[PDB]
Symmetry: D2
Subunit: 127 residues, 4 copies
């Protein structure tokens, strides 16, 4: 008798593939959940334009409670910290990878399956 | 303009973790989506009792169009095969892993982040 | 003109796969390199017997300079710390995994290939 | 007991990263082992030139028995096939990855640890 996701965080770097993850995250967050869009600062900084556009796409997709957020430093650690400070219950990202031997050999199976079967993959954490 | 998922496939082994994944999967499939519950066969077989209970769990969660299906041979290839044959647009599994050096060192980052942040992780496929 | 590995760290939980990784790590360390054998502490603690035996097997494999080390807390973070503290140049682990749908879906590709092609995999870091 | 590797394979795309992995693979191949350099085809031919540059770097690294070999189709499967056809006992790749939120979140832990500790990672298969 679980409840719907209340705090969704989605990462975007502005790529077209990335925007699809934003849309899906928007559809899930809807009008009752909080949607946080994040982007890693690799280098007004250009990231803010990416966040703004992403925030607009989210609104057009149905997300009413949207906010942007730059990620600083080692992205994954920052993301985990964000999830904890915002008590996120769902994290979303768009699949991506390299078509080279190394790029593929060093990947993760979930990302691989997602690409192989052109499907989305959901990992449910355990208490 | 994104609509909800139509064909949701979830994996389970009968453990507690798997049941949470089933709940979440059911909650998403709801009533207007097809929910296929899969389980890997690895020695009527006891797997059918697990699939039956999971099926009832999916029902007690809101899933209507529920159906069970045993996974045979290499589970990933089978799963990829099942999704392609059923036009699935969402695969779901409960997180799981080993806590030994090798167990943790050989895993995937999404699995790891899911555990560290006690949050679910969604990988959205691209074109 | 890259030279041979000088400081090798291998992890073991005392299983048979792990012991094979110990033999391989020992074969690489030989008589001119330092071999550090690590094991994650989960719970004289039983971990010391496992370490002692691993040390014995390393010697019988030609490794002259071998020391044991218990790993505490989150395993990967402890391993990264050890590698930094001992200036390691090669980490070794025996492949391992779960055979359930989730176990396989959440794994890494390098571990998958290792099992698929029954071969050892080596990831070379970059600057 | 165990003996050094006899058939070593190493993928490369010509990148600086790949070249470092070539050097390491060659250092291991030495003179009494065969080094098979591989490169994905279609991720006087661009791929053949890369393979040429690799054979030369390998030779200088101390590799005696070297041989170029283009990979066709999905790199991983081809690599797995190549491994079995050549009965390779070791695969080598240069660590590579994306720095975006998705890029790091979707990677594998072995690749990640290799980057964090700037160390090489070896996964020993079981039997």
């Amino acid at each position: 008798s679980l409840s719907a996701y209340k705090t969704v965080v989605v990462g975007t770097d502005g790529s077209d593939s990335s925007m699809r993850a934003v849309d899906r995250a928007a559809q899930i967050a809807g009008a009752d959940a909080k949607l946080i869009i994040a982007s890693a600062y690799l280098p007004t900084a250009p990231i803010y334009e990416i966040l703004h556009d992403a925030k607009e796409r989210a609104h057009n997709a149905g997300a009413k409670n949207v906010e942007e957020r730059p990620i600083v430093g080692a992205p994954v650690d920052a993301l985990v910290n964000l999830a904890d400070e915002e008590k996120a219950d769902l994290l979303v990202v768009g699949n991506v990878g390299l078509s080279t031997i190394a790029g593929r050999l060093l990947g993760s199976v979930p990302a691989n399956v997602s690409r192989r079967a052109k499907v989305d993959v959901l990992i449910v954490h355990t208490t």
